[PDB]
């Protein structure tokens, strides 16, 4: 009898990258499979941040899901398993409806080799959260490496970054025992560019500890987009080329 859920991803590295983006921030999580694609959402154990992953069925090269399934996955154990895959392997997920295990199959493109693993799942109760749609005061779209550098650099200066935004550019700032500093990006005139769409000036404070977990997703995209409004969480968004996205949510301070 056919597999309840079967999905074939040619660019299987996408799934390796997604698991590095997640495993260090959240250890246990729930993968919701439906006919429309894959969806995962979880808060870290401090309830300060939240990640929301979205992989549409259009993005896979073969997708079929007969029943809605909710798999509890130890993301570490998953990460170990997909570290066992080459970077150009073809990855295939496969599950029977009331899944006791998740099946992964790694096919090398030269056709020499065929690995297949089977991962135990676990029982979890997710506390799912309602994320409303909204339009944000400030939307920055900078290169992701630049963003990853700034968060790492400023984090030795101090514990918290102040992001401020007008339409001339964005400013990142921090301060601690040794001193303080501020970094200023301004807009340009491709994927190394920095554009802003801007409706009202913004300045919030965020714990950098969390932002350095979010940048583990840098391999997924050249660009990253940041969305800010007063007294609402920051949205660090990484596009997953014509397939979906990976969004980290981070609550501001006081």
């Amino acid at each position: 009898g056919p597999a309840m859920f079967e999905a074939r991803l040619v660019q299987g590295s996408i799934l390796k990258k997604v698991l590095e983006a997640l495993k260090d921030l959240i250890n246990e999580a729930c993968w919701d499979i439906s006919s429309s694609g894959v969806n995962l959402q979880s808060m870290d154990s401090s309830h300060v941040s939240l990640v929301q992953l979205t992989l549409r069925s259009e993005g896979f090269d073969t997708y079929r899901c007969d029943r809605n399934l909710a798999m509890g996955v130890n993301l570490t154990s998953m990460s170990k398993i997909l570290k066992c895959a080459g970077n150009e392997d073809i990855i295939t997920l496969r599950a029977e409806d009331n899944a006791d295990t998740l099946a992964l199959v790694f096919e090398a493109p030269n056709q020499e080799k065929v690995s297949d693993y089977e991962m135990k799942l676990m029982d979890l109760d997710v506390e799912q959260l309602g994320i409303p749609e909204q339009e944000y005061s400030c939307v920055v779209k900078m290169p992701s490496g630049e963003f990853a550098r700034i968060c790492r650099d400023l984090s030795h200066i101090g514990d918290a970054v102040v992001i401020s935004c007008a339409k001339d550019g964005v400013k990142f700032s921090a301060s601690g025992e040794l001193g303080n500093g501020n970094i200023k990006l301004s807009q340009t005139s491709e994927e190394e560019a920095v554009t802003i769409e801007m409706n009202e000036p913004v300045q919030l404070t965020f714990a950098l500890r969390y932002l350095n977990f979010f940048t583990k997703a840098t391999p997924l995209s050249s660009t990253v987009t940041l969305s800010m409004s007063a007294d609402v969480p920051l949205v660090v968004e990484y596009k997953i080329a014509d397939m979906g996205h990976l969004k980290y949510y981070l609550a501001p301070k006081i």
Partner: peptide, 13 residues
């Protein structure tokens, strides 16, 4: 000093 994320998003069922 950090607001929690549950102070901006509603818990479902």
């Amino acid at each position: 000093k950090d607001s929690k994320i549950t102070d901006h998003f509603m818990r479902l069922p």
